[PDB]
Amino acid sequence: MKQGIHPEYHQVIFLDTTTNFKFLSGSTKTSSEMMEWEDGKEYPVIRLDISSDSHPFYT
Amino acid sequence: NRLKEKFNTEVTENLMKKFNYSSVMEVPKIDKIVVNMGVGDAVQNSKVLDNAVEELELITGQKPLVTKAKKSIATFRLREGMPIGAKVTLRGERMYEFLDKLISVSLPRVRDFQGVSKKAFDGRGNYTLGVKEQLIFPEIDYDKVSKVRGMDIVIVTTANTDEEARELLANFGMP
Amino acid sequence: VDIPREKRVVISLTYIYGIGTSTAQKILEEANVSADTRVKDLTDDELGRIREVVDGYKVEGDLRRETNLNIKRLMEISSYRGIRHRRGLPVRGQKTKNNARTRK
Amino acid sequence: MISKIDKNKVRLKRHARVRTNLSGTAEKPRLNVYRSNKHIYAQIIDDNKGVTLAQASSKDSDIATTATKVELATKVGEAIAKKAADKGIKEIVFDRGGYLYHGRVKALAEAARESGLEF
RNA sequence: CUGGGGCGGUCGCCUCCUAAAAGGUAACGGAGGCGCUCAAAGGUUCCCUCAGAAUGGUUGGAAAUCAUUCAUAGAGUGUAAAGGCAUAAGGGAGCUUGACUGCGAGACCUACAAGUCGAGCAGGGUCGAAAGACGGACUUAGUGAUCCGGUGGUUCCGCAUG
RNA sequence: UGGGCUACACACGUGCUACAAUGGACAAUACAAAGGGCAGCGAAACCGCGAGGUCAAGCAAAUCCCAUAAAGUUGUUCUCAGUUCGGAUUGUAGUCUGCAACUCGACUACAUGAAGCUGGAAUCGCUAGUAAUCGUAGAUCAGCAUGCUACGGUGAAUACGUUC
Numbered sequence: 001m002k003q004g005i006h007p008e009y010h011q012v013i014f015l016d017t018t019t020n021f022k023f024l025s026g027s028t029k030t031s032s033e034m035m036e037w038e039d040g041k042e043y044p045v046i047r048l049d050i051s052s053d054s055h056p057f058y059t
Numbered sequence: 060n061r062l063k064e065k066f067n068t069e070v071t072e073n074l075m076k077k078f079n080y081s082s083v084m085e086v087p088k089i090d091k092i093v094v095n096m097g098v099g100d101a102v103q104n105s106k107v108l109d110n111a112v113e114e115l116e117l118i119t120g121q122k123p124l125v126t127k128a129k130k131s132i133a134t135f136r137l138r139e140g141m142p143i144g145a146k147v148t149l150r151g152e153r154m155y156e157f158l159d160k161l162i163s164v165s166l167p168r169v170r171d172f173q174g175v176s177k178k179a180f181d182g183r184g185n186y187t188l189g190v191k192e193q194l195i196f197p198e199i200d201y202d203k204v205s206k207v208r209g210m211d212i213v214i215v216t217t218a219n220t221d222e223e224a225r226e227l228l229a230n231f232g233m234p
Numbered sequence: 235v236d237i238p239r240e241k242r243v244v245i246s247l248t249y250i251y252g253i254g255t256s257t258a259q260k261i262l263e264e265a266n267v268s269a270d271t272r273v274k275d276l277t278d279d280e281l282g283r284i285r286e287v288v289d290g291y292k293v294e295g296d297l298r299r300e301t302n303l304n305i306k307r308l309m310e311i312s313s314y315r316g317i318r319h320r321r322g323l324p325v326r327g328q329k330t331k332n333n334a335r336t337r338k
Numbered sequence: 339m340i341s342k343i344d345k346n347k348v349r350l351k352r353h354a355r356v357r358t359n360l361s362g363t364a365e366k367p368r369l370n371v372y373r374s375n376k377h378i379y380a381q382i383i384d385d386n387k388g389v390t391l392a393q394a395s396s397k398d399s400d401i402a403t404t405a406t407k408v409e410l411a412t413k414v415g416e417a418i419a420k421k422a423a424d425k426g427i428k429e430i431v432f433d434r435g436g437y438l439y440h441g442r443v444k445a446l447a448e449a450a451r452e453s454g455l456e457f
Numbered sequence: 458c459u460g461g462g463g464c465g466g467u468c469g470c471c472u473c474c475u476a477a478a479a480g481g482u483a484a485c486g487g488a489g490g491c492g493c494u495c496a497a498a499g500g501u502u503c504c505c506u507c508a509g510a511a512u513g514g515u516u517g518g519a520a521a522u523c524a525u526u527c528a529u530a531g532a533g534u535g536u537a538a539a540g541g542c543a544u545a546a547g548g549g550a551g552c553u554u555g556a557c558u559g560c561g562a563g564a565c566c567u568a569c570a571a572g573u574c575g576a577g578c579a580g581g582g583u584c585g586a587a588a589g590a591c592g593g594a595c596u597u598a599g600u601g602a603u604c605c606g607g608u609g610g611u612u613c614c615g616c617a618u619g
Numbered sequence: 620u621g622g623g624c625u626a627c628a629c630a631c632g633u634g635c636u637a638c639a640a641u642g643g644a645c646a647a648u649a650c651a652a653a654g655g656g657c658a659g660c661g662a663a664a665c666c667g668c669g670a671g672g673u674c675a676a677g678c679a680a681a682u683c684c685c686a687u688a689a690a691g692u693u694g695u696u697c698u699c700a701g702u703u704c705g706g707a708u709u710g711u712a713g714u715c716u717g718c719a720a721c722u723c724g725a726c727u728a729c730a731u732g733a734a735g736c737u738g739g740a741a742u743c744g745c746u747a748g749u750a751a752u753c754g755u756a757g758a759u760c761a762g763c764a765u766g767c768u769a770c771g772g773u774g775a776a777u778a779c780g781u782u783c
C-alpha cells in the first residue's frame with residue numbers, strides 16, 4: 001500500500017481476439033482506445049498474445 | 060480482483076465433491092506467492108542487480124526485498140551483507156492478478172509440450188515452479204532489457220498433502 | 235525518428251537503422267521531397283507524409299529485434315548455420331584459416 | 339501447508355517479557371489490558387498478594403454499545419478509574435499486556451489519565 | 458629463576474585444567490590469550506528469533522538464495538577461554554549522549570600500597586505514553602608507582618609593599 | 620552414396636580491395652586490340668529493381684554473335700571524419716547451372732555496416748611504351764579465378780658515377 005516504492009499497475013484489459021482473457025496487469029501505460037465494460041476500464045494495450053488462443057496441452 | 064470468483068466457484072463445486080470436506084473453512088486455500096529470483100552471484104552483478112530489481116518490479120508491481128547473505132562460505136565470494144537475492148511475497152489480490160495472468164502465458168511462451176511438471180511438491184502442499192525468464196514483460200517487448208535471467212515462483216497453500224494441492228493446481232493449471 | 239539535420243535528406247535517413255539508399259527512391263516516391271533539403275527544409279508538414287511511409291517499414295530499431303531472434307531461433311535448433319554463431323566462426327561456409335579475422 | 343499462529347500466544351510471550359519489571363504493590367497497583375477482537379478488559383491487580391482491586395470490561399452491561407471499538411475503550415478507562423476512586427485513587431502502573439501502546443490500548447489509558455488516575 | 462652451574466627458556470596481567478563438590482593451594486605441570494577495539498559495537502524505547510535437518514525449487518558447486526516442517530539454543534554474543542544469556546546479554550529500527558557533576562551507607566578483596574561492587578543522595582539531563590531506565594560495551598585481560606618535566610585552569614601562597 | 624581434401628588459439632608466403640576531395644555518387648558522351656563460338660555464341664524485341672527468363676533474327680563465320688571496353692572527357696554534386704570515404708560480416712531474392720549447392724558454389728536484391736587515415740625495423744619489382752594503372756579475352760569448365768596466360772588504353776621519375 002506504500003506510496004513511493006510501487007511502480008504503476010492497472011486493470012490491463014488483455015485485448016486478445018480469441019475470447020479476450022482480460023485478467024492481467026503490468027506496466028502497459030499506453031494509449032487507451034477501447035475499454036470493454038465487462039473488463040478492466042483502462043488501456044487495451046495488450047493487443048495480441050498467444051495466451052488463450054491455442055494451448056499446447058488443451059489443444 | 061475480477062477473477063477471484065474462480066476460486067470461490069471451485070471451493071464448493073469441485074472440492075466439496077472431491078474429498079467431501081465437512082466444512083467450507085477447511086478447503087485448501089492459497090496464502091502467498093513468493094517470486095524469489097535466486098542468487099546471481101554479484102561480483103559484478105551488483106549493477107545487474109539494479110536491473111534485476113527493475114525487471115521484477117515489472118513482473119509484479121511491488122519492490123523486491125534484496126535478501127543478503129548469512130554465512131561466510133568459501134569457494135564463493137560473499138560475506139554478511141553482499142545482497143544476493145530478491146523476492147516479493149504476493150499476499151492479496153495481486154496474487155490472483157498475477158496467478159490468473161501467468162498460468163495463461165507460462166506454457167505458451169516457454170514452447171514446452173507438457174510445460175511444468177506432473178509433480179513438483181514437497182509432500183506438504185508447496186509447488187516451487189522454476190522459470191528461465193521466457194515469459195516476462197509481455198507488454199513492452201524485448202527493447203531495453205539487457206541480460207537473460209531465471210526466476211522462481213513458489214506457490215504456498217493451505218493444502219495438507221500432495222493430492223489436495225493437485226486439486227487447486229487443476230484450476231487452469233497444466234500438470 | 236532520430237535523424238540528424240544540416241545534411242541532405244538522401245543521406246540523412248541513412249543514419250537510422252534500416253535504411254541505405256532507399257530514401258533516394260522509396261521515401262522519395264511517397265513524399266514530395268527534393269534532393270537539396272538541408273536543415274532549412276521546413277519538413278514538419280513533410281514529417282507527416284514520411285511518417286506514413288516509414289510506418290510500413292521495420293527499419294527504426296525494431297528490425298534488430300527480429301534480427302536478434304532469428305539468430306536465437308537458429309542456434310536453438312542447433313544447425314550448422316547456427317553453431318557457427320555460438321562458436322569465432324565465419325558462418326557462410328568460408329575458409330577459417332589465416333584470413334578469417336573479422337569473426338575472430 | 340503453512341501454520342497460522344494465534345495472536346494470543348505470541349501476545350502472552352510478549353506480555354510475560356513485559357511483566358517482569360512491572361508490578362503492583364498496593365501503594366502503586368497495576369491495571370492490565372486484555373483486548374480480544376470485540377471487547378477491551380481492564381483490571382487493577384495488586385501483584386503482591388495476587389488480589390485484584392477492580393475490574394472493568396467492554397461487554398459489561400454498564401458500558402455496552404457499538405460505538406467505534408475505540409470509544410468503547412474510552413468508556414472502560416472512564417469506568418476503571420471511577421471504581422478506583424472508591425478506594426486507592428493513587429498512582430498505578432500501566433500494563434499494556436503484550437499489545438502496543440496504540441489505538442484501543444492507548445484510548446484505555448488516555449481515558450484513565452483524564453479521569454483521576456495519576457499514572 | 459634454575460632438580461649444580463652454564464646454555465636454552467622464563468619474568469606483567471586474562472582465562473581454564475591440575476585443585477581433593479566453599480574459598481585458597483606449588484612445580485622448568487597441561488592449555489591458551491592480552492599491551493586493544495567501538496561515536497554505535499554506548500544509552501533508551503520498540504519490535505524480532507537462531508544453527509542445523511530434511512523436503513523441492515529459473516541460479517543449481519555438495520553447500521549462495523526461496524518455501525515448508527522439525528528444530529533448546531546445537532546459532533550468535535568486537536576480541537583468548539570459562540561462566541553466562543531466547544528476562545535476551547542475540548538480531549533490527551527510532552530518538553539520543555548517563556562513554557554525566559558532587560558524592561556515597563555498606564560490602565568484597567588483601568601484608569602494605571593497591572583492586573572491586575554498590576543501594577541511595579543531590580545537581581543537571583536523555584529515552585519512554587507512563588512506571589521507569591541510564592555514572593560505557595554479557596562478565597572477567599587491553600597496562601606502569603613516586604620523583605621530575607610540559608600544558609591549561611585556579612577566590613591559595615608569593616619574603617618591606619605593589 | 621556419405622564424408623574429407625574447404626577444419627582452426629594461431630605462424631609465415633603471394634595477391635585482391637582499400638584507407639579518398641589529382642577522389643566518391645549521378646547523368647551524358649567517345650576511342651581499342653586480341654580471342655572465342657561442332658545444339659555452341661545467342662542479337663534486336665520484350666517481361667523482371669536486378670542477377671536474368673520466352674521464342675524466333677542471323678552462323679559452323681574478315682561478315683552473325685559474345686561486345687556499349689574501362690580509365691577518360693562534359694556537367695551537376697557532397698565539403699576535408701572512421702562523413703555520400705569501403706562494404707568485411709550477418710538475415711531477407713530463392714536468380715542460374717547442374718540427380719543434387721547442408722557440409723561446400725556463382726552472383727544481385729533491399730538491410731546491416733567492422734577493421735582501415737598511407738604503415739616501424741626491414742624488404743621487393745622496374746631503365747620507354749618499361750614502372751604504374753584501366754578494362755577486355757581465352758585455356759581449363761555443366762557451374763566457379765582476386766590465379767594463370769595473352770590483349771590493348773593511358774604513362775612518369777631517374778642513372779653524376781664505381782667507392783661501398
Ligand SMILES: [Mg+2]
Nearest residue numbers: 459460461462
Ligand atoms: Mg640432581
Ligand SMILES: [Mg+2]
Nearest residue numbers: 476479480481
Ligand atoms: Mg575449590
Ligand SMILES: [Mg+2]
Nearest residue numbers: 531532533534
Ligand atoms: Mg557457540
Ligand SMILES: [Mg+2]
Nearest residue numbers: 545546547548
Ligand atoms: Mg541489546
